[PDB]
Amino acid sequence: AKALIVYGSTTGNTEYTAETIARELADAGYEVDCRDAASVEAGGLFEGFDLVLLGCSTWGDDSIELQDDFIPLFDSLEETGAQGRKVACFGCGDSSYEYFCGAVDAIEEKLKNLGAEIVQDGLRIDGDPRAARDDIVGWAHDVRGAI
């Protein structure tokens, strides 16, 4: 199994999430390519991947904005090869904002509309990812089954 993890992270929380999930899937024997969304090109981005995991934190006060690096990729997602792709999504935010990890909800909606196959409900981390390290490792373990 070949996985691609793309993450948008401002303060490092989701990047630490994506590292932790990449180590879990590498430990289980998946090939893993993990990339900062700021370095990537939407063009056929997901071709050849058995599993694609997209991580993005949430910004904004009364509106949901996606993490700033991730926006460009999000806007071209139809250009990626997501139809039929087995995909899941994750992100850090904070339960005291009106839309808690609303970026994870906006990337899942867009992915579902594309015919993506979401194997697992989104990982939404409230607070510091280093405290929810346990739920991060189990979510990765669990996405390896939805497959």
Ligand SMILES: Cc1cc2nc3c(=O)[nH]c(=O)nc-3n(C[C@H](O)[C@H](O)[C@H](O)COP(=O)(O)O)c2cc1C
């Ligand atoms: C100004 C501001 C606005 C934010 N808005 C939201 C939000 O609407 N929903 C949410 O769940 N978290 C929100 N957050 C929480 C951040 O997503 C959280 O701090 C996250 O740990 C950042 O992840 P990052 O380090 O990967 O970019 C906000 C944080 C700040 C400072």
